Every structure is written in C-alpha cells, then in structure tokens.
Design a protein around this ligand. Sequence first.
Ligand code: ANP
Ligand code: ANP
Ligand code: MG
Ligand code: MG
Ligand code: ZN
Ligand code: ZN
Lengths: 364, 51, 92, 567, 81, 656
Amino acid sequence: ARHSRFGGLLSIQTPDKTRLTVSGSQALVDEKIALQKLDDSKKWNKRIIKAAEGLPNSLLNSQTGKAIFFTESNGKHFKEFINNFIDSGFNILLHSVTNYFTTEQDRMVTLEQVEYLLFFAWFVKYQLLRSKIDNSADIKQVSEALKEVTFILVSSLLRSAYDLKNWTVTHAGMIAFNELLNLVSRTKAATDIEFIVSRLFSDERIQLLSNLPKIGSKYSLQFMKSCIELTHSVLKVLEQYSNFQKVQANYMTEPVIETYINFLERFRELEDDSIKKVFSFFHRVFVQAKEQALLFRFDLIILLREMLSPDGLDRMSRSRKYVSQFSDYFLARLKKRLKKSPAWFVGLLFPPLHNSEVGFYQRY
Amino acid sequence: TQLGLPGVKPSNSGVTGLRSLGVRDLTYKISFLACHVISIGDQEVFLNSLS
Amino acid sequence: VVIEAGALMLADNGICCIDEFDKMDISDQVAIHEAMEQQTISIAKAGIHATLNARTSILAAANPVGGRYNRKLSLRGNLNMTAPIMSRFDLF
Amino acid sequence: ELGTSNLNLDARNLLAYKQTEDLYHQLLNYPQEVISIMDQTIKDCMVSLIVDNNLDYDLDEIETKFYKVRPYNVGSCKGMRELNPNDIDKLINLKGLVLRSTPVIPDMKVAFFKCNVCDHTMAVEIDRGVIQEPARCERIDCNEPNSMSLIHNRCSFADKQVIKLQETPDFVPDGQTPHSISLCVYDELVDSCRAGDRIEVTGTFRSIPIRANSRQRVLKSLYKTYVDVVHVKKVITDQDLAKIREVAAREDLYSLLARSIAPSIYELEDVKKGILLQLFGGTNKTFTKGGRYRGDINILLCGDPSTSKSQILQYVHKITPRGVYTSGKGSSAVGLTAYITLVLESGALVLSDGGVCCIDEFDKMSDSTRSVLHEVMEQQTISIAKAGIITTLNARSSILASANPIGSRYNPNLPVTENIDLPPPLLSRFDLVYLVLDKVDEKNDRELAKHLTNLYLEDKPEHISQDDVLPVEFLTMYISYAKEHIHPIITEAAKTELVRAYVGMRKMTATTRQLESMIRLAEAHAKMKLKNVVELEDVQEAVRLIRSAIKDYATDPKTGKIDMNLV
Amino acid sequence: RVTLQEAPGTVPPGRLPRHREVILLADLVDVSKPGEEVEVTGIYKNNYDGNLNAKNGFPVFATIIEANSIKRSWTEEEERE
Amino acid sequence: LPSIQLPVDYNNLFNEITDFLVTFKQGPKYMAMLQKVANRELNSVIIDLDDILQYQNEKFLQGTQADDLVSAIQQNANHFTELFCRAIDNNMPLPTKEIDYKDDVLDVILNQRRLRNERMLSELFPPNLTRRYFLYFKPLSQNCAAISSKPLSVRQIKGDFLGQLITVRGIITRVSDVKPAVEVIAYTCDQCGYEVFQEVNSRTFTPLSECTSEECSQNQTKGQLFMSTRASKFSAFQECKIQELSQQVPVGHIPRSLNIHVNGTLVRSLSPGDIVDVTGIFLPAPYTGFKALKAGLLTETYLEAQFVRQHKKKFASFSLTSDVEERVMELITSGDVYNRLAKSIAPEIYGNLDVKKALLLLLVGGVDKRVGDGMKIRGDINVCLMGDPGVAKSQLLKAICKISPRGVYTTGKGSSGVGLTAAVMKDPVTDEMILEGGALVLADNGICCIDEFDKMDESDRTAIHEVMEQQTISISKAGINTTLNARTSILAAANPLYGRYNPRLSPLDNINLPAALLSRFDILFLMLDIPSRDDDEKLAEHVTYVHMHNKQPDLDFTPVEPSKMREYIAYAKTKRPVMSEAVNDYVVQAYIRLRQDSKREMDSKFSFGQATPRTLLGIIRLSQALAKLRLADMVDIDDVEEALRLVRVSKESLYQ
DNA sequence: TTAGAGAATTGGAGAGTGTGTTTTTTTTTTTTTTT
DNA sequence: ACACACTCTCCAATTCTCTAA
Ligand SMILES: Nc1ncnc2c1ncn2[C@@H]1O[C@H](COP(=O)(O)OP(=O)(O)NP(=O)(O)O)[C@@H](O)[C@H]1O
Ligand SMILES: Nc1ncnc2c1ncn2[C@@H]1O[C@H](COP(=O)(O)OP(=O)(O)NP(=O)(O)O)[C@@H](O)[C@H]1O
Ligand SMILES: [Mg+2]
Ligand SMILES: [Mg+2]
Ligand SMILES: [Zn+2]
Ligand SMILES: [Zn+2]
C-alpha cells in the first residue's frame, strides 16, 4: 500500500536461535512470501542441457497453440476445398502414393518421410472431428488408411527411424501411428480390424511402444507431449480388448515417471486437456495398480504446492477438481506409510534402493 | 542525459540498478502527446461558411 | 527577451485596453507612442534583430488631475498626458 | 458503505484500552513496522465483516483496495530547532505556516520488462529505490543474457509532492529570523494545502545521505533531513444547530455579537458593529452578462493617536480564518500584490483571498504604493503584464485600514476631507469611514481609568469588560455557518426605501457608490439574523450606521467643519 | 554563415517571424550585408545534434540551407533624354 | 620513510592520566562524574587543566619527579582526546542504579552477535560505537598562569599554531542550523544474515557493497549489503564564523575571520552579534581523492570549539546561587539602594541626579501584561533627553551603553530607517531574496540608544512607530511576508529647534516633534544650560579634579561597581509586583486632574500638548519599576507619589 | 544393470588494460551623486 | 590515483561416451 522507501526491516529467528534478515513491508505479515523471497536472492542456477534440424517450420518443432487467421469468405472457401478433396480424392491418392513407397522405401530422403507422415495425420484427424460433429459426414471417406499395406509402411518408417536414432522422423512417425490407433478405436465402436489389432500388438511392437516414453525425458516439450498422447491411446485400446497385466507392468517404472513429472511442471504453457491425461495416468499408477512407492519423491511434492496454490491453476478451471481430489488421497496414504515406518523421512529425498534383501520390504 | 546518448556527458531522488545506468540515477517528467487541436476562443466565403 | 510577445502583439488586428493610463510612467508612455505612430515594433539587442507588425486599435481610460474635472480649464490642463500622444486619439 | 479507504486514529485511545498500553510506546519508537501491521489488520477486519455477517458486497472489490491508518494527536508538539540526531526514525508533531508547494512529481512503483528477441514480459517490484533487473530472459527455451529491456510508459507510478513549512513566530530565538523545514507527502494528501495556510502535522523524522558527484558512489559525511508526513490537521451536530438557532432568537443579539468580538476594549460600539458586518459580508452575485458584483466591505479607521485603533486590528487579525496584518512602511507595490521571480509569486492581497487584510500606518505609504489598491478594491482582480508573463488573478479580499490625520492630531479648523487628506479616487472606494476623537471628559475618563487599572489587580487577569459575552469558538461557528447557508434577497419594500434614502442623501456629496455600499451593508445585516430576505429594518440600519460613522450630525452642512461641542 | 529571417510583410498577423541559417562557400562569401532583403536557392539539409536531443528528449534532428545561388546604370538614350 | 627521536613517550603520560583520573580531589573528583555517566545521568566530561597543574605541584612537593602534562596537552592537543577516552573506558565503574537496558538497539544487536560467535565456537566492533559521552578541555586560569590563557585577535593566529589549543576573542557573524553527521555506519547482509560496520572520519566516504566476512566467503555466499539507520551512530554538528572587533582593525585593512566547528552537547551555544572568548583546537582541513592530487600544498583551516566564555551575563542567564545571594545581601542590609545605584551611574559626571534616577528606572522597566482574550500591553519604558549643547547628553547616553548586557548605539545622521529596523536584501549570487534584521532587532530584549535624534529624516523616523508601542516589525516585500520580534526600549537625545532653547516660543515650538511620536516616550526630560557663578565654580572644581586624578572626588560616597550593580538589577527583574485597590483609587484620581489641567491650558505658554490614555500606563510602569527595585511583591502608594514627582520634575527647567 | 575411465565443452575467476575527473536583458530593494 | 568499463585468458567443473563385470 505505502511507497517503496517507507519500508522497515524484518528479522526471522530459526530453531537453534539463529537469525535471518529480509526487507519490505509485506514480509512483515506473510511468512510464505518471506520464505520464498529469502531463497530468491541467491545467485546460482545450475546450467542446462538440450533435437531437430534441416526442414521447414511445421508441427514437429513449433508450439501449435497459435492459429492463423481467416476471412469469412476464405474460411468457407478453404473448408469447401479440403472437404471436396476428402470426399473425392483422399483414398485414391493414398492408395497410389503408398503402393509406390513400399517398392522404394530404401531410397527415401528425410523430407519425403516427414511429408507422408504429416499428410496421413492431418486428414484422418480432420475427418474424425467432422463426423464427431455431424451425421452428414461419414468415416468411410478416409478408410483407405487402415488396409494392411499402409499399416505396414507406417510401422516400418517408425521402426527404421527409431533404430538409426533419427529423432525427427521418429517424432513424425509417432504422430502418424497415434492417429491410426485413434481411428481403430472409432471403427471398433461400430471383422478384419481385430486381425489388424492382433498384428499391431505382437510382442515386438509392445517392446517398442513401451520403450518410447523413457527416452523422452531429454528432448523438447513437443516430443514428450507426443509420447503422452500415444501412451493414453495405446493403453485404452488394450483396456477394451477385454495379456493386460503383463503389458501394464511393462510400463510402470522410474524412468517413465521421471518424464511425466518433467513434462507436468511446465503447466503454465500447456492445455487444459493434457493435464487431464497426466492425472489419468497417475490415477492408474497410484490407485489401480497399487504401486504407491513410485510417487513418494520430493520434486512431486513441490509441484503440487505450486500448481495448487493461489499462484497457478485458476480457482475455477476444471483442473483443480482433479488435482485437489488427487492430493487429498496422496497425503492420506503418505501419512499412513510414514507413521508405520519412520525411515521414509530420509527416503523421500532419494530414488528408491535396488538392493535385493531390503528393497522388497522398502517398496511395500 | 543519464542514458547512453552519443556525444553528451551525464548531468527528488530517482531509481537505479538498471544495466544502462551503472551507478547513475534516473528521473522522469510528465507531458501530453496530442493527436489534434481545435480552437475555442471575402463575403462569399463567409456566406458559404454560415448555415 | 527571454523573444516573447507583449500585449500589443497579441492585440494585432484587435482592440487593446489600457486602464488608469494616467498612472503609466513616461518612460513607457513613449513606447506606446512609438508603436502607435507606426503600427510597428522593433527589436535590436544582444546580436538579435527583429521587426514586427502591430495593427492594433487602442482604447484608454484616465483620471483628471486632482481627481475631479475643472470646467475652467482645457482638457490639456485637466489631463496628465503629453501633447503628441493626445494628438493621436480620434475621439475624447 | 461510503466506499472510502483511510481511517483516522487519535493515539490516546491506545492508552485507554489495557491491552494496548505498551503498543502506544512501540508506535512512537518503531513507526514504519507498526503502521504496516495496523494497515494489514484493518483490511483483514473489513473482509471478516462481510464474510462473517455474510453480506452482499463484492469480496474482490475489497481485496483490490488498499486501506491505510493515519495516527494523530500523538503527544506534545516539538520545536523545529530542537530536533536532535537521537530523534531519527521516531514519530514527531510540528506546528507552522505553509510557504510554497512544488508541482506533483511522478514516483515509480512497478517496473515493466520485455524480451527483445522472443517478446516475453515480466512485471518487477521496486523496493529501496533499486530496480531488480533480471540477469537472463526467464522463458525456458529463450534462456539468453542481456535479453530483457525496460518499457517506461507501461510501468506504474505514484504521486509525490514537497511542501515547505516555516517556523511560527512564537518559537523564534531572541534577535533572530524564523527557519523552515521540508515535508514529503504522497497519494491522498498531495494537493491539500496552499500558500499561507496554517497547519499541524504528524510524521516520521528521516535522514538520508547525498552524493558528492553524479558519476560515482561517493557520499558526503553530512546527512540531509526531512519529515515524512502521515497526517495533516488545520489549527455539524444537531446540538450545534440548536444552539445557533436559539442564540439567533435573542433580543440583544446585535449588541451581544458586537461587544464580543473584542471583549477587553472599552466602548467604541459603532466601530465594533461596523467590523462585525465586515466579517459577515454581503452576497456574491454573478450574471450571465453584465459581470459580477463584490460582496466584500472595505473599512477605514481615522483619528487621534492613543485611541486604540491598532489594538482593534489585532482582534480582527486573529478572528478571521484567513488574513494578513501589515504596516505602511513595511510594504512595496510588488510585495502587496505579486512578484516576478521564470515564475510568478504571491503577495499579501493574494494570500489574503477570501479573508481580511489589515493595513496599519496607512498614512505613511507613498502615493505610488497606494495607487495599486484602486484596481484590486474596485474589481477584486489583479492584472499583470511584464516580460514573459501576462495574466489576471482573483482577489476577493476585504481591507481594514488605520491612519492618523494630517498634522497627526485632528485639527477642527480644517474641513473633514482636508484632515483625512486621501485623494478622492481612493477615499471613494471605502464603504465605511470612521472619525474617532480624543475628547476630554471627566465622566468618560473615570470609567476608562477604572477599566485599565482593574487589569493590574491580578497576576493573570480573569476580569473582563462585561458580564455576558460569547466564547470565541462558538462565535466563529455562528459566523462561519451564516456565511455558508444564508443568502438574502432584496424585497420590493427594501427597494423603495433604498431609492428614497439615496435621493435624500443626494439632493442637497453622495456618489453612486453610496447606493451600492448601502445595499451591501443591508445584506450583511440580514445574514447576521439568519434571514433569507432584506427588509425595511435592515435598510434603515445600514443608513444609520453610515451617518453615524463620519459624524455627519455634528458636521456644519455648508462649511464642512465639525463642532467639537456636539461630539 | 548567414542568418535569414522572414520579411515582415510576409509574416501573418499576430505571429512571430521564423528564422533559418545559410552556409556560404568559396565564391559566395560577402555577397550580402546585414539588413538587406535577399532571395536564396539551395539544398535543404539536416544533421544530428546531441544538445537538441538532450534538451528536447526526443530523437530530433537539426536543419540548415546550403546556398547554390543568391539574389537581391543607364544607356545613351537616358543621357540624351 | 625516515624517523627521528623526540623527548616524549606516550606510555608515561598514559600512566599519569590513569593515576590522575582515580586520585585527584579538591571521593576523587572525576570518579563521581564517571559514576553519573555510568548511570546514564550525564552526557559530557569537562577536564580542568588547573587540576592537572595542581596535581603536578602536589606530586612535586611530595619529593617525586613528574612529566609536565599541562604543556604536553597544550602543544599537541588532538592526540590526548583519544588517550583520555581510552583511560575513561578502561576505568569506568559499574552502574549504581537500574537503567532499563532493553531500550538500546546496540545492546540487543551486540548481545545477539556475541551469542552467534558463542554458538559458532561450539576487535569485534570499533569502540567508538559504544561511547555514550563527550569530552572537552578547559584552559588554564590566567590568574594561575601560558598561551591558552591569553586571548588572541583573529590576526595573530599565524600558521605556527596549527595543532595547538588556543583562545580567540571576537564577534560572531553567522551561525548554521543543526544537522547530523555520521561516525559509525551499520550494514546488513541479506543471504548469510550477518552485520558489519564502517567508521567515517573524512568529509566523504564510499559505502560498502560486498560481504567480505570469512564465514560468508567460505560458504561462497556472495550476498548483498544494505545500509541501516537504526543501528548507526550520529553526532550533532553545527558551523559558525567569528570576526575581529572593528575597533582593533589596523588602518586601511579589511577585517579577517575564522570558521568554527561545534559537536556534542556544546551545540547551539553561540549566537550572532555576541562578543565572546572562544577556546578550542586549531587544525587543517585536508583535501580528498583526485582533488588532493592537484590542489597543491595550500591548506584550508578551522577551529574545533572546546569551551566558550561570554563577556556579559545576559539577564535570562540568572539563577540565585548563594554566592550571588551573599552579595545582594550587602546592598539589602546597607539600605537606601535607590539613591546609591542612581549615584553610581557615570560618577565622573557632576549633578544631574534626577536624570540618572530616570535612567535607572529605564534599566529596570515595567511588567509585561497579557489579557485573557489575547490583548497584550507594552512593558518596556521609553525615555528622551532634550537640551542645549554641552550638557553631557551624549556622554551620559554612552555611559548607560556599558551597563546593559544587550544594547546598541546609533546616531541619527548615520542611519537608514530600513537598516534601523530590517532589510530585504538580494544578497546571494543566486538571485535569492533574504531578510536581515536591523539595529532594533539586534537590541531585542535590550536598550537601543539613538543620538542626534533631531538630525534624522522625518520620513525615516516613522519606521520606529510600530516597534515603540507593539514591540514587533511587519514586512511585505518581494518574496518575503513575515513578522519579527523586537522587544526593545529606546533611549534618545536631541537639541531643540535653532540649537540652544529659545524662551520667546512655547515648549512645543522648541521641541518640534509630532504628537503621535511625542506620546510614545514615557518620560521626556528638558535640560537647559543657564549660567551661575556659584554652580559653575563647583562644576569646574569637580571636573578639574577628575582630569588631575582619573577618579571622581569623594569624601562620603563610594559607588557600587558595575558587576555588583548588574547582579542587583538582574535579580530585581524577576519580581512581577501586583497593584492593589488602595493604590488604584489614588492613580485613578490623579489621571483626571492631569487631563483637566491639560484642557485648561492648551492655549498657554506653559503647554506641552494633551494627556492621552498612554500617560496613565506610563505612571503604572514607573510605579512598578520602583516596586521592583525594593524587591517587593506589591506596589505601594509610596511608589506612586515618587513616580508622579519624577514626571513633574522634567518640566521645572522652564522656570530658570 | 552398475560403475569407472577417458574426452569434450563451457564459466567465470581474475587478471589486465584503458579511461575520466579539478575549475543583453528583465524585475526589485537600497544607497549614492546628480540636477 | 582513484573508481569504473571493458577485454582477454586459463583452468577445472561439468556431462557425455565407451568398456567390462
Ligand atoms: N477604549 C480603550 N480600551 C482599551 N484600551 C484602550 C482604550 N483607549 C486606549 N487604550 C489603550 O491605549 C493604547 C492605545 O494604543 P493603540 O492601539 O496603538 O492606539 P492607536 O489608535 O493605534 N494610537 P496610534 O498608534 O498612536 O495612532 C493601548 O495601550 C490601549 O490598551
Ligand atoms: N555635569 C557635568 N559633569 C562633567 N562634565 C560635564 C558636565 N556637563 C558637561 N560636561 C562636559 O561637557 C562635554 C561635552 O559633553 P557632551 O555629552 O558631548 O555634550 P552634549 O550634551 O552631547 N552636547 P551636544 O552633542 O552638542 O548636544 C564633556 O567633555 C563633559 O565632560
Ligand atoms: Mg497604534
Ligand atoms: Mg552630544
Ligand atoms: Zn526471451
Ligand atoms: Zn554475508
């Protein structure tokens, strides 16, 4: 309220009678602010590490929460052009271009790979959205994507890209393979499609699709987001297959959880929808699978304060419903654990301990 | 004058700690940035002017 | 000099009102006389020279000497004003 | 419910309640911290009222506002010269007179930064005068050095002003001249006070270093000192209205008020009455066209020495809310009106606007200086036209003047106008002119001698000239209220009497100004009775007082001399 | 260098006259005397000035005129007449 | 680089100092003072060099050698302020009474800092930070005496004296207002929560900006320092200037001056216009920084004040110690003080006894009065002397100028009404307007003497009108609008019109003063030079004796000296005697008679104008002055009849 | 799957270098010589 | 010579990669 040179001085005394000094008039009354302001003065930050080059701007290396803007005549003319394209051209175009590339895959160049995978993705998604909206549209228009040859080809691109550690094609292939699965769940909600699933979920591919979130921890914010959305779809299909317990245990371990938190803490930049996806996964880890020991780690506990405070997530966004309903249960189970075995106070700082004789009792 | 103006040396207390100032001190003045002005203080031209 | 305009400049193509004219110093009455003679003002000092136009009509008020007019005397006897200035009013 | 943000608090209440007896001392010893604590207490209490009593008011609105306490009546006042280095950062109380105020200065409170490459933005808090500029741009993917920059016109500022306060003459050392101190004032209180105001303040007494040069951090050993004010005070109820209306119903009201403006002065009743009507004043009038007409009355007191004229000017100078006392040999033409310094500055008649200007030894100042008063008295405006400045200023100022005749004692062998000796254009501008004469008479002299000698029968006298007089405070209340709420109008009957009376004085010298001054005096008389109309009685009193002041009944109508035997 | 001012007949009523400054080079020096009424052709030119910027507080440039030319007997028939 | 031997070792002198502080007595003298310091009752210690001289003599008479500490601290005074302070700090006793220690911020800070060090372990701060006292030296008594006892004029202060302790005589020209000066500055470090101090001696300093503490450094904690007032130490500072007396300036030269500095409890002792014996330490003022490199070897200089002696005790400084009591009892027991005191004014002037009695009542004066409604009435008395040439008017006037502790002398031709009252001067180079008071302001609460009152211009004399009756000055000029205080009594002298008084005309024709001014004097005395073989012989015999012996001739009468006279008058100006009803009736009846007699004789050769109401209050003022001189608390009718006689006698010179 | 041995990239400590610094009115109160 | 602004340089702290138990 009063000006910048009126300010007095504050002293704060710890246990063991040692004292600190902070300035400003709000520190007199708000200890939370004083504690935060105290640490904020300190100089150092640890310096930091950093995936894609050689190609024009696209979804792969830009934040796409930023539209481009249409006149009304332009909006309707563009809608007319691609709607007639889809109703008229899409299957005949994809059938030709795919049965080319199966005969020519060895000779490819990075751009043609990234074109094919981001033409597939766009048109399949747009049609799903259009028929979600209205009954005049139908899914049969995009149905060339599912037949067996194209499925093999998207698979093969993703495979070869992953092995040679080419991360941009791997990123695009992740986006294409996401949509194919999304389209399958649509069609199952209506014969050969189950055959296609069974071939899509041979054990080899589960090894790959399980592997993929683990490496995401290092890379850019989009890569991790692709990993999350693909994982959500991948598990949801296999939930409605009915094997399942083998597959879910395959996913749950430290390096996946690391990625989830590392992505979640940049929530100021993300959508309302993506956080719904992350907490869905934590509900799966914590309540259903009953693998509670993964999340007792300190940088999660910081996060829930920031995001839940009057600082961050809005008092009325749908996110706070999910977050506060999660944290309540979290702290109840944590209370129970800590009073039953006091060693976890020193546990909470560090990774869990992989020794055979003590580790089993540690995790449970 | 207290900023890095080429060819001129530096010249109720101001504000400080900004990069360009170094150890110097900065103050401000209030003025009005207008966009138009209107005053309120041949017979043929005059007659055409009237209603 | 400060050059900035005086009263006679603001009253160009206008009426300039002088109240209690008889109280004005002679050293300044002569300045008004010189301006009224030419409808022009001149500046020359400190290396700066200027000439300005003063097409202004004057309206003045004054007190008779001793506060009350004397019917025994001419207006010249009654008024504390020099003859060249008095010669330049159209109406009294 | 009034939508307002500041709470007054006289500190004595902290001593009455047992739980805060020590908080009173802590307030004086640690103002910056304690006042902040009080602020954040008040705001929380305001929130608690609406949420506990579950009222309709917007919680967001109350959360948005700032609330501030303003403590006052802290203790004894302190002499400006007696503040010592052991008083630094404690609360202080001062009395004084305002000289001048600087224009409002913008003071920064929040800084605004923008990234030059990626257009990220940050708002930063200012404390202790230093901007806490970021080292690197804080956007994760744009972690670059020297990348942020300040945008001046998107910052947030606050108002600061500096007031110059002067020592009151009551405290100055023997054989010395008064000193002054500077007050820093912020936000609400910024434009509160004008030149010539008389105030009491409350604030922290601060000190700060000053730099040797603008290039480097080198400080001087002497420290600057100033005051940081948190409250300002100038030096209604139905009971007050009941008292005022009841007093106004008394039969002896006019004599009661008149003898109560200057209680210890013996007789001089007509002089006191005229001064009372000057205090009330006429009515101010403004037309759509044809101008504005002054409500103020000008008075001249002229006569023999020792007659107690200057003693009366003391009472008027202390009764009036605004005003000045001065002397003839003490005043220049510039000092009396306004001064070029490039800026313009105020003189006595401008500081006295809306009040009374007392001028003593009026017969000593030169014709050059007195000629300045013609325009100000007639128009109540001051026109100026000098190098670089040309303007007109308002001066709603009432003059009360004191003089002695030519030859320094009234000479009965000369006519009255020749004894007074002011020129006619200036003598025509006074509403009332009084002759007061040192006439010998044993009856008068015994009473005067008994009155003056009675003051020495006690060390600090309780004695006073009359049994029933009003206290100064209540009398001030009456006059102030009557000036604000009452606005008399001319009745047709009053119009007929004024025309008749003017023709009577005219046909025989009465000028046209005698008519207007009669109207103004009658209006002043009407306000003093809390009437809304001027009546025949008021007109006749205005006429009677004019005839009485200049001893007209004793005047030879043809020769203009006064028969001293008739006095 | 020469200072040039508006002729009093050209100045509108109730306004002060304006000024400009002219630079004269090799052949043109002392072509004119103070108080003469003169006519000038030249380039209109500007440059940075620190003091103007410092006093006004805006990026304001100063201007000058570089003159290219400057302007202001009898026959036997007259003698015979 | 090089070094020398010198005859002084400071260890021996330190031992002498610590013995002196614990042993000397007139218990020991200085230990009582240090107990008062420890109790927080006393703020300053004044060391007397007469004590050190006495101590040296006593130690010598006991048969032992000792160093001459008195000359040692006069020759190099600056260093011994530190030695005495260290000795006092070493030997300071413990408090006798409870203090409420928690009122001190420095105590809390240092206690917590000590506790931090105690915990950490499981000079600290400069000693100047906890010296609650000030210390000053007082020079040798000249009657015991050495240079510090002998006053110097401001010309005699050569460059030889730099560093020494000296005494200076002169007039003060101007005084600054008080402002704080730092001694020890205090800072706080944000990250490590630790405090550091800095000490300032020079006129300028650089503040600290890095926490160089070893613990903070070893934690690699590059924290930020911030300044704090609440634990810094300040001291009061004031600066003045002194200038040589005008009657000591050698012909054709311009007067010189010195800069004086004042710190501690000695502040606001000096005032402008005082004649004073200042004593202190004379020092140079070195330059700092880049300026020093190109200033050269010429040094600025100033005087550190230590003690101040005034020449005349102001009446406001009086208090009745029994030393003064014993002396006023001499006059009281001897009796008839009115005649003795009047006869004692200017004994070298013969006769004129009633004039001297009137001037004694001028020195005493009436009682100030202030009524419950805010009216106030003049207490001062105004007197005028009107007479022929050669009757000792200027001489008697200038004699009274010596007795009064505040007073000024002025003559009518040498004086402007402005400079006599107050002036608005455009004095600085900055075009600022400043008010500067005139002679009547410098004579505030004193007497103002105006000689040749008849030569002063008629217009300028009007400036005095406001001051005479209202005791104040009012000015309204360019940029200045204020009232000043001028509580001054005026004494004036004049010749009648045409010089020697003319009996052909009335007294009012000869006097030639306007009515408004003639009324403002409470007494106007008329004195004429009329030959007489008998009186001329007696006067000549008296004056010739005085020229022969430098002494007034005496057989019976001993005058009281001016000092004891000042003590009696100063004691008498405290009494405020009240009137009574019996007295009031008498003066009320007297006043009527005066005005009736005036009315009867306004036509007459014996006229002197008309009695106004200001003649009644003149009687009351003279009566109350007479009541003060007899140390009463009650006016008596005996006073009133004398007050009337003293007014009547002024006119008898008209009757040869 | 852990861990330890070797290589590459980056930060800023701190040392060094050059630099800048002292220093014609126009309006208004007052004294003085001039008509 | 005394605070500053700016440039240059070296050294070790750090993370990344490869190998074998
Ligand atoms: N009627 C009266 N009532 C009270 N005091 C009076 C009266 N008449 C005279 N006096 C006293 O006489 C003195 C008058 O002083 P003052 O007020 O200066 O009178 P004045 O009219 O101004 N005379 P002067 O200044 O010489 O023109 C004061 O002490 C008054 O108290
Ligand atoms: N009664 C006296 N006793 C002693 N000396 C006297 C006496 N009367 C006159 N004188 C001498 O007269 C001389 C002149 O005195 P002074 O005071 O100058 O006179 P004055 O009254 O001021 N005359 P003036 O200035 O011309 O009006 C001095 O030397 C005195 O000593
Ligand atoms: Mg008076
Ligand atoms: Mg003399
Ligand atoms: Zn950025
Ligand atoms: Zn530190």
